[PDB]
């Protein structure tokens with residue numbers, strides 16, 4: 001064993017990472033960067049080993065040679081004999097969510113509305129909806145489709161950032177890390193809940209986890225699922241209990257990536273760290289829970305039951321799936337070979 005150097009994105013992940021490192025007796029230590037892209041560069045340079053990534057960022061890391069190691073696995077819909085670590089992953093449902101009270105907004109009337117996105121380059125947040133929209137409109141001018149948005153990672157003076165709010169101080173508007181008030185699944189959903197945006201592009205789970213008292217957080221504690229609808233590609237609106245019939249795509253789960261040459265070591269260490277700090281882990285909750293952060297999804301989604309071994313030593317293309325990979329390649333033609341770095 002060597003120590004594994006985790007890469008934390010922004011200061012709130014970094015703080016979580018430091019508690020993990022303390023509790024692991026330095027089996028894990030922490031590098032931190034301002035953006036996911038910057039953490040991927042640290043890993044490429046060998047200044048960090050690994051981080052957990054959305055599928056759109058796996059595409060970026062993968063084009064640069066990093067490889068998937070273990071995947072987030074959340075509670076299966078169906079009972080399984082299989083241990084979590086062995087259970088195959090089931091993707092998550094990317095959806096578009098609006099206020100029920102915003103009547104008559106549908107997928108087909110999104111143009112010139114206000115949008116909330118988890119971040120540029122992320123799956124449910126970006127790649128799926130904007131790939132869909134570019135294709136449906138026949139235009140690469142996706143930066144002109146909504147009147148204003150919060151899409152963290154975009155140009156802070158552009159309309160794609162006009163709705164983002166920055167941190168407590170109002171600084172770091174539109175930065176793609178949890179300091180941006182509207183960053184990520186929970187930030188984009190809060191962007192909708194507070195009626196900053198007309199639509200949020202998130203996943204099905206986000207809606208459930210932040211409504212009907214599932215979150216105690218001040219902005220979320222009062223929210224009721226019935227006040228929300230999903231937008232279906234057929235132009236219909238459904239209640240959020242129907243995401244299986246009204247989603248934009250099924251996404252590949254967030255997964256850990258590292259360099260090939262560190263993958264087996266990163267895997268071993270993680271399997272052991274989750275035995276200690278994961279769901280039901282020997283030292284969670286008394287000491288530290290790797291998969292909790294007060295709904296802030298820091299390092300890992302809060303709904304992760306375990307990190308699960310992958311079948312078939314998949315390359316990043318195999319992990320993401322050919323179709324998703326081709327959807328991303330297609331969209332990036334708007335703004336098929338090389339590492340972006």
Ligand SMILES: *[C@@H]1O[C@H](CO)[C@@H](O[C@@H]2O[C@H](CO)[C@@H](O)[C@H](O)[C@H]2NC(C)=O)[C@H](O)[C@H]1NC(C)=O
Pocket residue numbers: 127128130131132135322323326327330
């Ligand atoms: C947007 O349209 C593109 C361009 O047609 C779609 O790309 C095709 O996807 C199919 C199914 O995976 C492939 O058989 C074709 O080879 C792809 N065409 C090209 C030119 O690459 C893409 O999937 C659509 N995007 C989204 C997000 O649905």
Ligand SMILES: *[C@@H]1O[C@H](CO)[C@@H](O[C@@H]2O[C@H](CO)[C@@H](O)[C@H](O)[C@H]2NC(C)=O)[C@H](O)[C@H]1NC(C)=O
Pocket residue numbers: 075076077078093204205206208209214241242243244
């Ligand atoms: C959409 O996401 C929600 C939230 O994760 C899912 O509801 C959970 O489903 C599990 C497994 O069925 C239940 O044991 C949980 O108690 C549910 N959580 C809550 C907060 O209600 C829901 O199944 C997902 N829907 C689809 C179609 O995938």
Ligand SMILES: Cc1c(Cl)cccc1Nc1ccccc1C(=O)O
Pocket residue numbers: 128131132247248249250251323324325327
């Ligand atoms: C539509 C869908 C369902 Cl329903 C389930 C699962 C996936 C999809 N779609 C896609 C899957 C991968 C890549 C691109 C797409 C897309 O067409 O946006």
Ligand SMILES: *[C@@H]1O[C@H](CO)[C@@H](O)[C@H](O)[C@H]1NC(C)=O
Pocket residue numbers: 001023024025027273276
């Ligand atoms: C640190 O790692 C070594 C080697 O795997 C092991 O003996 C020890 O259990 C680990 N401790 C923690 C607290 O993760």
Ligand SMILES: [Fe+3]
Pocket residue numbers: 054055122123124125251254
């Ligand atoms: Fe995602």
Ligand SMILES: [Zn+2]
Pocket residue numbers: 247249250
């Ligand atoms: Zn589907």
Ligand SMILES: [Zn+2]
Pocket residue numbers: 312313314315318
């Ligand atoms: Zn293979």
